[PDB]
Amino acid sequence: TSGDNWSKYQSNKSITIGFDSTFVPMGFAQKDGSYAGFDIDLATAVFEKYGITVNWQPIDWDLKEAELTKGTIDLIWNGYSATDERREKVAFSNSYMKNEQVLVTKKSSGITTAKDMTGKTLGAQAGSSGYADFEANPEILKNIVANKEANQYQTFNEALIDLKNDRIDGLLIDRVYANYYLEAEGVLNDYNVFTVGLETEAFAVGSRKEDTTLVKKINEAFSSLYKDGKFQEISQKWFGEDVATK
Ligand SMILES: N[C@@H](Cc1c[nH]c[nH+]1)C(=O)O
C-alpha cells in the first residue's frame, strides 16, 4: 500500500518522531538543550533493533495531528494517550504504560477534591487528552469550575508557573508529569496531586493509519525489550518502578 512506508524508513535508516519537548519525564529538553526521557530511551532502543536512527523533532503539541498527516513527522511518541477520539484519526502501537489525569493544586488552597474547585479557575494543556476529557465528561469539572472553562496553555510548564502564581487554582495534568516535575523542582510538598474520577489512560505510539508495518515493527520490538532487560532498565531509570502493563 502506498502509505505503508516501512521500506523507506528501513532503507533510509531514519524515522522522524515528534514530541512536546517539555513533557517530562517522557521526552524533554534538558539543562544543556539535549533531549532525554523514557520515550527517548525507549524509541531509541526500538529503532536500534532495525538499525534505524531517530530524528527527534520538537513540535507544537497543538499541531501534532497536522504534522503527522502532512508527513513532517512519522510518529507521535511522547506520553501520547491512546484515546477513542484519537483512534478516529491515527493508528496506535500496543500501549506501554498506564497514566491518569490528576488535578494539581497548591496545598495552601486546601483543595483535595474536584468539588472544592467549585467557582475556582482551572487550567489545562490545550492540545492534551486531559482537556478533551474535561469537555467530554462535563460532570467531573467543567460544570462546576469558574466560567465552565479551562484556561489553555501550549505547555504544562507555563500552566504550572501560572498555578504557582495563583493565576489558576487547579491544573488538569498527567500524573506522570506532575510526579516527576514536582520532585525534580523540589516542591512535591507544596502541592496536592489527586485523581478526580476520569478513567485511566494508557500511552502508546501514534502513526498514520496507513503505516501498518511500522506499527507491527514497534510492537515486535517491545516484545524483545520486555525480556532483554532494557524495558525494565529504562523504567527504573525514569520511574523507580516497573511500569510494564504486565
Ligand atoms: N498525555 C497527554 C499530554 C501530553 C503528552 N505530551 C504532551 N502532552 C496527551 O497525550 O495529550
Short mmCIF file of C-alpha atoms and ligand atoms in Angstrom, two decimals:
data_model
loop_
_atom_site.label_atom_id
_atom_site.label_comp_id
_atom_site.label_asym_id
_atom_site.label_seq_id
_atom_site.Cartn_x
_atom_site.Cartn_y
_atom_site.Cartn_z
CA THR A 1 0.00 0.00 0.00
CA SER A 2 1.27 3.48 -0.92
CA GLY A 3 1.23 4.94 2.61
CA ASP A 4 2.91 1.86 4.19
CA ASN A 5 6.39 3.45 4.36
CA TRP A 6 8.30 0.87 6.38
CA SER A 7 10.62 0.08 3.48
CA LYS A 8 11.58 3.77 3.27
CA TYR A 9 12.38 4.10 6.99
CA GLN A 10 14.37 0.89 6.81
CA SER A 11 16.37 1.86 3.69
CA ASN A 12 16.96 5.44 4.85
CA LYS A 13 17.85 4.11 8.32
CA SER A 14 15.89 7.03 9.71
CA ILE A 15 12.49 7.90 11.13
CA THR A 16 11.21 11.26 12.40
CA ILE A 17 9.45 11.35 15.75
CA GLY A 18 7.51 14.33 17.03
CA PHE A 19 7.22 15.32 20.68
CA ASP A 20 6.37 18.14 23.07
CA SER A 21 9.89 18.92 24.33
CA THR A 22 8.61 19.98 27.74
CA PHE A 23 6.78 16.74 28.55
CA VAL A 24 8.74 15.23 31.44
CA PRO A 25 9.77 12.52 32.05
CA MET A 26 8.87 11.18 28.59
CA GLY A 27 10.79 13.43 26.22
CA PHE A 28 12.14 16.83 27.11
CA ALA A 29 14.92 19.37 26.65
CA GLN A 30 17.48 19.03 29.42
CA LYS A 31 19.66 21.67 31.05
CA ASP A 32 22.04 21.55 28.06
CA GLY A 33 19.24 21.58 25.46
CA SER A 34 19.67 17.90 24.52
CA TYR A 35 16.64 15.63 24.60
CA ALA A 36 16.13 12.91 27.21
CA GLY A 37 13.40 10.83 28.76
CA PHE A 38 11.65 7.50 28.96
CA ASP A 39 10.33 7.71 25.42
CA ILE A 40 13.65 8.99 24.08
CA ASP A 41 15.31 5.90 25.53
CA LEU A 42 12.51 3.50 24.57
CA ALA A 43 12.18 4.70 20.95
CA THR A 44 15.97 4.67 20.54
CA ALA A 45 16.04 1.04 21.74
CA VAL A 46 13.12 0.07 19.49
CA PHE A 47 14.67 1.50 16.36
CA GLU A 48 18.11 0.12 17.27
CA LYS A 49 16.61 -3.34 16.64
CA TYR A 50 16.29 -2.33 12.95
CA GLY A 51 19.43 -0.23 12.57
CA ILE A 52 17.31 2.93 12.36
CA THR A 53 18.37 6.27 13.86
CA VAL A 54 15.66 8.55 15.25
CA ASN A 55 15.39 12.14 14.11
CA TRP A 56 13.75 13.89 17.05
CA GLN A 57 11.55 16.79 16.01
CA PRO A 58 10.09 19.02 18.70
CA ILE A 59 6.56 20.04 17.72
CA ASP A 60 3.81 22.33 18.85
CA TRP A 61 1.57 19.83 20.69
CA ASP A 62 -1.47 21.65 19.25
CA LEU A 63 -0.39 20.71 15.73
CA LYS A 64 0.57 17.06 16.24
CA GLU A 65 -2.18 15.57 14.07
CA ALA A 66 -1.42 18.00 11.25
CA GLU A 67 2.32 17.30 11.42
CA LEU A 68 1.71 13.56 11.29
CA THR A 69 -0.88 13.71 8.49
CA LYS A 70 1.21 16.08 6.36
CA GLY A 71 4.34 13.95 6.80
CA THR A 72 6.65 16.32 8.65
CA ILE A 73 6.85 13.63 11.39
CA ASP A 74 6.31 9.84 11.12
CA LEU A 75 5.29 9.10 14.74
CA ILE A 76 3.93 10.86 17.77
CA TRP A 77 5.79 9.39 20.77
CA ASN A 78 5.72 11.48 23.95
CA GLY A 79 3.35 10.16 26.58
CA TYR A 80 0.73 10.11 23.84
CA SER A 81 -2.57 8.94 25.36
CA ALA A 82 -4.40 6.34 23.26
CA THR A 83 -7.97 7.58 23.28
CA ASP A 84 -11.04 6.57 21.28
CA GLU A 85 -11.26 10.04 19.77
CA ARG A 86 -7.67 9.81 18.53
CA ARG A 87 -8.24 6.33 17.07
CA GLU A 88 -10.56 8.01 14.55
CA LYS A 89 -7.53 9.90 13.19
CA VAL A 90 -4.35 7.86 13.83
CA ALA A 91 -3.19 4.29 14.44
CA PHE A 92 -1.58 3.15 17.68
CA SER A 93 1.02 0.64 18.76
CA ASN A 94 0.26 -1.55 21.72
CA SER A 95 0.20 0.52 24.90
CA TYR A 96 3.38 0.54 27.02
CA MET A 97 2.45 2.49 30.20
CA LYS A 98 -0.65 3.40 32.23
CA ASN A 99 -1.39 7.02 33.06
CA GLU A 100 -4.01 9.03 34.92
CA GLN A 101 -5.23 12.58 34.68
CA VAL A 102 -4.89 14.37 38.01
CA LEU A 103 -5.60 17.77 39.45
CA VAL A 104 -2.73 19.70 40.95
CA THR A 105 -3.49 22.49 43.47
CA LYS A 106 -1.37 24.43 45.93
CA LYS A 107 -1.51 22.95 49.42
CA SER A 108 -2.36 26.43 50.64
CA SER A 109 -5.66 26.18 48.70
CA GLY A 110 -6.88 23.33 50.87
CA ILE A 111 -8.39 21.78 47.71
CA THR A 112 -8.02 17.99 47.65
CA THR A 113 -11.22 17.08 45.78
CA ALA A 114 -12.84 18.16 42.50
CA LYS A 115 -15.91 19.52 44.28
CA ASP A 116 -13.79 22.12 46.04
CA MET A 117 -12.95 23.56 42.60
CA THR A 118 -16.46 24.99 42.55
CA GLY A 119 -16.16 28.55 41.26
CA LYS A 120 -12.35 28.18 41.04
CA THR A 121 -10.13 28.67 37.97
CA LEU A 122 -8.91 25.59 36.09
CA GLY A 123 -6.01 25.35 33.66
CA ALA A 124 -5.18 22.69 31.06
CA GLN A 125 -2.85 21.99 28.17
CA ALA A 126 -4.79 22.97 25.07
CA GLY A 127 -3.78 20.02 22.93
CA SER A 128 -3.96 17.43 25.70
CA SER A 129 -6.11 14.37 26.13
CA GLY A 130 -6.91 15.79 29.57
CA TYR A 131 -8.57 18.84 28.08
CA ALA A 132 -10.54 16.64 25.71
CA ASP A 133 -11.81 14.59 28.66
CA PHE A 134 -12.68 17.82 30.55
CA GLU A 135 -15.03 18.72 27.69
CA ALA A 136 -16.36 15.18 27.18
CA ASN A 137 -17.15 14.50 30.86
CA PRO A 138 -18.56 17.80 31.99
CA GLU A 139 -19.95 16.47 35.28
CA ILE A 140 -16.44 15.95 36.65
CA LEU A 141 -15.11 19.51 36.48
CA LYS A 142 -16.49 21.65 33.65
CA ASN A 143 -19.89 22.16 35.15
CA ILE A 144 -18.52 23.45 38.45
CA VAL A 145 -15.35 25.40 37.70
CA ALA A 146 -15.42 29.15 37.08
CA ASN A 147 -16.91 30.01 33.67
CA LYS A 148 -17.31 26.32 32.77
CA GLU A 149 -13.96 26.68 31.00
CA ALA A 150 -10.27 25.91 31.36
CA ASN A 151 -7.51 28.43 30.84
CA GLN A 152 -5.48 26.94 28.00
CA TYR A 153 -1.71 26.65 27.66
CA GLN A 154 0.58 25.30 24.96
CA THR A 155 2.79 23.60 27.59
CA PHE A 156 2.31 22.34 31.11
CA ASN A 157 5.38 24.29 32.25
CA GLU A 158 3.64 27.58 31.63
CA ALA A 159 0.45 26.31 33.24
CA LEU A 160 2.48 25.33 36.31
CA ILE A 161 4.07 28.80 36.57
CA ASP A 162 0.54 30.18 36.45
CA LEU A 163 -0.57 27.78 39.22
CA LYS A 164 2.48 28.80 41.30
CA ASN A 165 1.42 32.44 40.87
CA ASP A 166 -2.27 31.94 41.80
CA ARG A 167 -3.42 32.76 38.26
CA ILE A 168 -5.19 29.39 38.17
CA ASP A 169 -6.36 27.41 41.22
CA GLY A 170 -6.03 23.92 39.77
CA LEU A 171 -4.32 22.29 36.81
CA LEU A 172 -5.55 19.19 34.99
CA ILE A 173 -2.40 17.28 34.06
CA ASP A 174 -0.89 13.84 33.51
CA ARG A 175 0.16 12.16 36.76
CA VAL A 176 3.49 11.01 35.31
CA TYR A 177 4.39 14.58 34.52
CA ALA A 178 3.22 16.03 37.83
CA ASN A 179 5.09 13.42 39.90
CA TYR A 180 8.38 13.86 38.04
CA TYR A 181 8.21 17.64 37.71
CA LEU A 182 7.35 18.33 41.32
CA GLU A 183 10.10 16.06 42.61
CA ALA A 184 12.67 17.47 40.18
CA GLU A 185 11.85 21.03 41.21
CA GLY A 186 11.88 20.12 44.93
CA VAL A 187 8.29 21.21 45.54
CA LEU A 188 6.28 17.98 45.92
CA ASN A 189 5.39 19.14 49.41
CA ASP A 190 3.95 22.46 48.18
CA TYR A 191 1.17 20.84 46.06
CA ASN A 192 -1.70 18.36 46.20
CA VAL A 193 -1.92 15.83 43.36
CA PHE A 194 -5.08 13.76 43.10
CA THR A 195 -7.32 11.92 40.65
CA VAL A 196 -10.85 13.18 40.04
CA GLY A 197 -12.62 10.15 38.65
CA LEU A 198 -11.57 10.23 35.00
CA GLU A 199 -10.91 6.82 33.54
CA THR A 200 -7.31 5.68 33.33
CA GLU A 201 -5.32 6.28 30.17
CA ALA A 202 -2.54 4.33 28.50
CA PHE A 203 0.33 5.70 26.48
CA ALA A 204 1.05 4.31 23.02
CA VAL A 205 2.84 5.36 19.83
CA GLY A 206 0.84 7.11 17.13
CA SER A 207 1.31 6.67 13.38
CA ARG A 208 -0.51 7.47 10.19
CA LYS A 209 -3.25 4.86 9.71
CA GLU A 210 -1.60 3.54 6.56
CA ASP A 211 1.76 2.86 8.27
CA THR A 212 0.67 -0.63 9.37
CA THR A 213 4.01 -2.37 9.03
CA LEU A 214 5.74 0.30 11.15
CA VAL A 215 3.24 -0.34 13.97
CA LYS A 216 3.94 -4.09 13.86
CA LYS A 217 7.68 -3.42 14.00
CA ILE A 218 7.27 -1.22 17.08
CA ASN A 219 5.17 -3.94 18.76
CA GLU A 220 7.65 -6.70 17.89
CA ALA A 221 10.48 -4.62 19.32
CA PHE A 222 8.51 -4.12 22.54
CA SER A 223 8.36 -7.94 22.85
CA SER A 224 12.17 -8.14 22.74
CA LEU A 225 12.69 -5.20 25.09
CA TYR A 226 10.43 -6.73 27.75
CA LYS A 227 12.61 -9.82 28.01
CA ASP A 228 16.09 -8.47 27.27
CA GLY A 229 16.18 -6.27 30.37
CA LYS A 230 16.04 -2.99 28.51
CA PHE A 231 12.43 -2.00 29.19
CA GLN A 232 12.97 -2.64 32.89
CA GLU A 233 16.23 -0.68 32.89
CA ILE A 234 14.56 2.35 31.24
CA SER A 235 11.56 2.09 33.56
CA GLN A 236 13.71 2.02 36.69
CA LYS A 237 15.79 4.92 35.42
CA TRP A 238 12.81 7.27 34.98
CA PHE A 239 10.18 5.91 37.43
CA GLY A 240 11.91 3.83 40.09
CA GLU A 241 9.42 1.04 39.36
CA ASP A 242 8.29 -1.38 36.65
CA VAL A 243 5.59 0.39 34.62
CA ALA A 244 5.12 -2.55 32.27
CA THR A 245 1.48 -3.29 31.56
CA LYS A 246 2.02 -6.90 32.69
N1 LIG B 1 -0.92 12.59 27.62
C1 LIG B 1 -1.42 13.88 27.09
C2 LIG B 1 -0.49 15.07 27.44
C3 LIG B 1 0.77 15.21 26.62
C4 LIG B 1 1.68 14.32 26.16
N2 LIG B 1 2.68 15.04 25.55
C5 LIG B 1 2.40 16.33 25.64
N3 LIG B 1 1.26 16.46 26.29
C6 LIG B 1 -1.72 13.78 25.61
O1 LIG B 1 -1.48 12.71 25.01
O2 LIG B 1 -2.22 14.78 25.06
#
